[PDB]
Amino acid sequence: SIVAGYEVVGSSSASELLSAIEHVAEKAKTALHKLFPLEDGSFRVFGKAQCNDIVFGFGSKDDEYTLPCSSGYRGNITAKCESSGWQVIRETCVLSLLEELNKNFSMIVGNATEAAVSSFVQNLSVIIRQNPSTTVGNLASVVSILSNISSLSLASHFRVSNSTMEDVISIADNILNSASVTNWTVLLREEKYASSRLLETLENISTLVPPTALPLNFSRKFIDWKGIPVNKSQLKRGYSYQIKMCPQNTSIPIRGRVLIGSDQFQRSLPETIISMASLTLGNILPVSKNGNAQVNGPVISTVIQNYSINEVFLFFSKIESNLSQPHCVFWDFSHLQWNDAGCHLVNETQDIVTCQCTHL
């Protein structure tokens, strides 16, 4: 009902002041019961606030407090007092404009047009650009909305324009900020697939940008995106895709490269070769906790429609040091985990790790 948390300041010791309060605890309880109806057994006095915080308050072990959101956001914040502070378990704080935009969409899924989705993504891009706070409730919603757009555009064979693909990338860059990983970690505690869904949505949307809207390059701070059309040129040089991302915690740039030899294009050339990369994805794509491994390189993606590639070379820079045993892996959407089937290590330099996968 109404949990009342107070504090008693005294000049004695913690054990003496405590013992003194417990011995008159029933006389304080009878004085409070003359002003308010109290629950039986609720009076508990203790001299150690395990968790104490301005946002939530003080509480004992396993205590769980649920508080409302703030202005503009709708939902609730839940946290339980553990040995390490107030761990937020459920945060459902969603921006009103984001939720309001999410609710106009439910009336559009029925009769949806290619121009209607593009203006919707644009209205989404402006909302996140103006209010850039990537709260867990926002992260869950943006991933949801983008996936409802991706699934709608795929199930309708809509075409993502080049201005619409820029808005999706802008949205991605905002929610892929390095300051969102902690909140991303909270989201995965509930929706363990939201980070994979974002990656799958980005990849599915990228396949819908037609060759007429390419070449296209969106190099942001937390995500790079490059798409080119295919001509008889790919039969000659092969496909190359390079990135140079400079995070703040390293003076050295974290580089990545995809090399597809000209021999892999021997069959009938597809239509578009979309590639993209990011560093924050490495921290939000969950790795097995039983293993002490970790993503020590940029997450690199490359999509080719209706085309199977049997050999792709990938060059990954090492972000962190003192790590050994490089393990070339790809993100398995089906099993929701990193997987090494088809990818083998070629060579490890003091700076970059070279991989070679039998699938793309």
């Binding site: 970790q294 993606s301 490359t302 790590l323 959407f333 790790v353």
Partner: peptide, 13 residues
């Protein structure tokens, strides 16, 4: 698909 690398810290013995 989407590729990266995993690395583990050196464990003695």
């Amino acid at each position: 698909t989407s590729f990266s690398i995993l690395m583990s810290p050196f464990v003695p013995s």
